[PDB]
Amino acid sequence: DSFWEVGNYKRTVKRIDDGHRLCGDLMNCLHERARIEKAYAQQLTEWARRWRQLVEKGPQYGTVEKAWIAVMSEAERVSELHLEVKASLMNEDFEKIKNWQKEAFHKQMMGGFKETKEAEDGFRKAQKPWAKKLKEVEAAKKAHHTACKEEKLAISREANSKADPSLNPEQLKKLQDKIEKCKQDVLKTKDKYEKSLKELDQTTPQYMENMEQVFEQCQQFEEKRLRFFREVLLEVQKHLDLSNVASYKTIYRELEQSIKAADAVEDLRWFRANHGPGMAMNWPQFE
Amino acid sequence: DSFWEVGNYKRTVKRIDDGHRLCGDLMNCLHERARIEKAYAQQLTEWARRWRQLVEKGPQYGTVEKAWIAVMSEAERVSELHLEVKASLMNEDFEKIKNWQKEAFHKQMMGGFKETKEAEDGFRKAQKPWAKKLKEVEAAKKAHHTACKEEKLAISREANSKADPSLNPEQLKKLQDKIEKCKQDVLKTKDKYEKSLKELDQTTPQYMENMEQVFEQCQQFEEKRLRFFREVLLEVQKHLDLSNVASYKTIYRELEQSIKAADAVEDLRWFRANHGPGMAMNWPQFE
Ligand SMILES: [Ca+2]
Ligand SMILES: [Ca+2]
Ligand SMILES: [Cl-]
Ligand SMILES: [Cl-]
């Protein structure tokens, strides 16, 4: 069926509540992910703390130890970034939505929202006249299609004397009497039936305005929401994007640094002077 | 105290068994790293399957819907990357260390490594001659400082003769013989104490030389593990680095462009003509 048909704006008004619903959704969606971003960061700092300790108590000293611990550090510094994502999603994006939802929706006392009950009210009194003066027409339709069908009944019960030569005098008098009263009956109904249509076609213009006038407002409101989503999702896109960052490559430019700084020659060197033949020795002498 | 003191070559030998353990530690270190990269991916893909349904089943249609879902996609393509890390870590870095750690370590039929019992036996082979040559000197020490101190007591037997005209020169002869007997036990022992040292010096150049080769043979083997750790870690750093990854930057340049394609006007135009004043209508007529 059509929107212009009485009470079919229902699905345009329903979009309002759906709008409020789509806010909470976009919030939970962001939040639920923000929680995952922290889950990763937390697992990294925990892991780092674990091995930064295991390596410490480990038997592996020297420059290699530093090169090793450099990875525990990268894990931490990565956690710092991902731990920043979380906040960037909640403190900014999430809230920026929560606020928009309140400054756009107002919970009516009874139920639903103000801007929802208003659209309904608006559409109603913007369709009322075209609906009421649609009853005059419809009440005239079943008033004419009842008389116009009543005419054929007279035309039928008029030739009922083609077999029975009964009271012919009183017959052709009454038969041609009812078909005449029915002639004006169908004509007077059509006359008042054409009127109702005029009375409606005159209500149409004003009805075409008030409706679209109430509808246009909804579109504008929905626009503010759509354009708002494109605005938030973009920010979110930048809060997830770590490729377009400089501090990221840094973490992996310095990791390569520390690892390369592992001079094996220098390690064996140290070990040679502290545990190897490089140690002093009181060679046995006369006492 | 010093490495050159007999037996004090354990620290440099214990280094061997440590080298093995260390490998096992670094393997667990990487395994736990990837195991987290996996859990992080699993959480992402499931976050996608989670909301990719809620959005498609939700009241959010049109371009804005696509822009929204566009996020789920980035959440998947990212998860896919961290899964490449898990594999790279376990299939290469890990399987590499494990492989190396077995090709350089062979457990005995008794326990311990063939290379552990390799250096120890080697050290003893080069130190035994020096040790046994020293055990003689050590005995000569409790040989000269046993007759030389035995000499000092011989003077006591004479010093005690200051106010005791006891025996005759007959006894003086008994203490007079110790002049050409006790003194000999000091000049003959000190003479041999010389030999023990002189002869030991003939067994120290060959001693250090030999003791050196063994130690260097450890420096060689140890070097291999060190340089290996460097080679490995370098690769590991590269398997964790998503900075210089072509696919990574693309993910977001693609997400962003997808969100910018979210035309608000596009969605609006559609609704008005599908549920609004745009819909056609059978304006009442004569029947
Ligand atoms: Ca250590
Ligand atoms: Ca949908
Ligand atoms: Cl409220
Ligand atoms: Cl209220």
DSSP letters, chain B, are --TTSTTTTHHHHHHHHHHHHHHHHHHHHHHHHHHHHHHHHHHHHHHHHHHHHHHHTSS--HHHHHHHHHHHHHHHHHHHHHHHHHHHIIIIIIHHHHHHHHTT--B-SSSSBTTHHHHHHHHHHHHHHHHHHHHHHHHHHHHHHHHHHHHHHHHHHHHT-SS---S-HHHHHHHHHGGGTTTHHHHTHHHHHHHHHHHHHTTSHHHHHHHHHHHHHHHHHHHHHHHHHHHHHHHHHHHH--TT-HHHHHHHHHHHHHHHT--HHHHHHHHHHHTSTTS--------
Contacting residues for A219 by C-beta, under 8 A, at least 6 apart:
B268, B271, B272, B276
Ligand number nearest to the C-alpha of B267: 2
User: CA–CA distance from B189 to each of B109, B139, B186 (Å)?
Assistant: 50, 11, 5
All residues with CB under 5 Å from ion ligand 4: A 108-109
All residues with CB under 5 Å from ion ligand 2: B 56, 61
Helix axes A203-240, A114-125, angle to 10 degrees: 160
Coil vs helix vs strand at A261? coil
Other C-beta atoms closer than 10 Å to the C-beta of B241 total: 19
How far apart (Å, rounded) are the C-alpha atoms in residues A84 and A91?
10
Helix (H) or strand (E) holding A35: helix A10-57
How far apart (Å, rounded) are the C-alpha atoms in residues A247 and A77?
10
Interface touch B279/A2, C-beta < 8 Å: yes
Ligand number nearest to the C-alpha of A52: 1
Q: What is the DSSP letter of A93?
A: I
Ligand number nearest to the C-alpha of A106: 3
Q: Which two tokens stand for residue B271?
A: 């609704």
Coil vs helix vs strand at A263? coil
Contacts of B223 in chain A (CB under 8 A): 264, 268
Contacts of B286 in chain A (CB under 8 A): 193-194, 197
Q: Are A90 and A34 in contact (CB under 8 A)?
A: yes
Q: Are B64 and B264 in contact (CB under 8 A)?
A: yes
Q: Are A9 and A3 in contact (CB under 8 A)?
A: yes
Interface touch A236/B282, C-beta < 8 Å: no
Other C-beta atoms closer than 10 Å to the C-beta of B160 total: 10
Contacting residues for B258 by C-beta, under 8 A, at least 6 apart:
B66, B67, B70, B73
| Residue in the structure block whose two tokens are 């377009």 | A244
Q: Which two tokens stand for residue B42?
A: 């699993």
Helix axes B205-240, A63-87, angle to 10 degrees: 20
Coil vs helix vs strand at A127? coil
How far apart (Å, rounded) are the C-alpha atoms in residues A17 and A105?
9
Question: What are the CB-based long-range contacts (under 8 Å, 24+) for A78-81?
Answer: A78/A41, A78/A44, A78/A251, A79/A40, A79/A41, A79/A42, A79/A44, A79/A45, A79/A48, A80/A41, A81/A41, A81/A242, A81/A245, A81/A247, A81/A248, A81/A251
Interface touch A244/B252, C-beta < 8 Å: yes
User: CA–CA distance from B256 to each of A230, B68, B71 (Å)?
Assistant: 10, 11, 9
Q: Are B236 and B54 in contact (CB under 8 A)?
A: no
Reference A149, options A139, A160, A141, A161; nearest CA is A141
| Residue in the structure block whose two tokens are 């700084």 | A261
Q: Are A44 and B37 in contact (CB under 8 A)?
A: no
Reference B52, options B84, B76, B80; nearest CA is B76
DSSP letters, A211-226, are HHHHHHHHHHHHHHHH
Topology of domain A1-278 in CATH is Substrate Binding Domain Of Dnak; Chain:A; Domain 2 (1.20.1270)
- The residue ranges of DSSP E strands in chain A, in sequence order, are none
The residue ranges of every structural domain in chain B are: 1-278
Residue B169 corresponds to which amino acid?
Answer: P
How far apart (Å, rounded) are the C-alpha atoms in residues A31 and B75?
14
How far apart (Å, rounded) are the C-alpha atoms in residues A112 and A125?
20
Coil vs helix vs strand at A5? coil
Q: Which two tokens stand for residue B148?
A: 């030389």
All residues with CB under 5 Å from ion ligand 1: A 58, 60-61, 65
Resolution, expressed in angstroms to one decimal: 3.3
Cα A74–A75–A76 angle (5° rounding)?
A: 90
